[PDB]
Symmetry: C3
Subunit: 180 residues, 3 copies
Amino acid sequence: LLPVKYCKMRIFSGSTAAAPEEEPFEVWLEQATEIAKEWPIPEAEKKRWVAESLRGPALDLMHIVQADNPSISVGECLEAFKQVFGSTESRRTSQVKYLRTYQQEGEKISAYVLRLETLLRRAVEKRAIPRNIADQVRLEQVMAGANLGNVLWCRLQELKDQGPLPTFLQLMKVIREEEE
Amino acid sequence: LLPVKYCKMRIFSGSTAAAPEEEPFEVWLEQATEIAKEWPIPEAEKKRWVAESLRGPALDLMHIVQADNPSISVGECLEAFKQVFGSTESRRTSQVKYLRTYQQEGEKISAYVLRLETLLRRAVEKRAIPRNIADQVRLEQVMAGANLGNVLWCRLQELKDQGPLPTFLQLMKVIREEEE
Amino acid sequence: LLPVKYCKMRIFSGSTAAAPEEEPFEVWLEQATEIAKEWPIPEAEKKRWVAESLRGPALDLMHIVQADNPSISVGECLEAFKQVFGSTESRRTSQVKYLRTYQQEGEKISAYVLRLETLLRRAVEKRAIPRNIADQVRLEQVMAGANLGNVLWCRLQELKDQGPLPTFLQLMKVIREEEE
């Protein structure tokens, strides 16, 4: 009889021309694995609740996969989705895509350093960057790739020379304080 | 028979078109209160020595106030002067006139920060600014209101982060050392 | 029967229009004094080995000096060379030639500060600068005489206020780290 808290299913589609409602695949797989492993419901409704989150090309893959094997488990479907849509980067290509990444022509700089920190985690999980130098490659890649103002650059240059280097949180604090 | 030194009387007139010889009223009252309280001679001599420091519109007020009551004391005259010329500012208007005060189009920044400190003392005696944040509002109002850049901005922004904040004297030293 | 690693003789000529192969006189005298004092052979071999390092006007002086006194020692020849080519500076002129020395129109600033330290040593040898202020006159002459801006100016300005002043080596390290 009360109001009820609806909550939005995370939609995925796999098109490059993605709509604003649609996630990157790595986020969708974190939902689909919950439906696969954690929910208690039988496999026939797991399949449906996975399928009801898909749209466009990604839904076509679910149809292809199920039609080519009607006995398939949801776990084996998610292996097919990992194989088609999961990112195939190597140690070489993840270092390159990280180091190639500069501040975009429309970005404010505090968005750039936050965007950049996700690529560092991507590269560290590939073992393409050692954890013990992550701070160095943060400051260096920010200072290489950002459109820095002089008064920020002095404070970043000081911090690079300081001895103990910034956390990502402190680097964001310093950059945010110069966004004005 | 020796040389002799006449330390000059502080002249006041109350006109907006004040001549270079003429004090702000708040300074003249500090002289007139000396002649009122401290000097030993009778009220008739005090009246004349007060009047001899007044000129133009402020002298006209002394004539009005005396003519409407010849029995008046010099102390009671200075209450009339406080009422007509003494600064009428409220708590808000002292903060607003402080925060509105930017570096003038012909000022060097080393003059501006000293001009500005007098307005802070004005606002503190109104209890409009808490004494314990005076240093913050110095650095902030300097950095907001002055025409500085780059090399000086770095040292001031550094000092804002340094822990214990500058005295007015040290802030003046830093700004003067960049006037060159 | 083996390769031999012969090392080039330091040629000197004393012309203002010096060729790229030719040393300044102070470096040549440091070789000629070795041939005078340290080599074992007689004066008649010393004279020839000194003369074989000279060219043009400096060789003409060796001929003049020997012809006007064939009894002369190699040491007394080098006294004639010190008298004709050795620099005749004074406390006044060495301070001026140092403080007048700015960064050249084609120089990198890291080359300029190294050139500048040689002039400081020149001045200290004439007692024209006290050794205990050499650090101040480095930072001040760099900051006055270089072409500078932005992050390096801020770092140099900080270092002037830092307490213990830079060595020349550290001042070079700082300037080189901003040459990029």
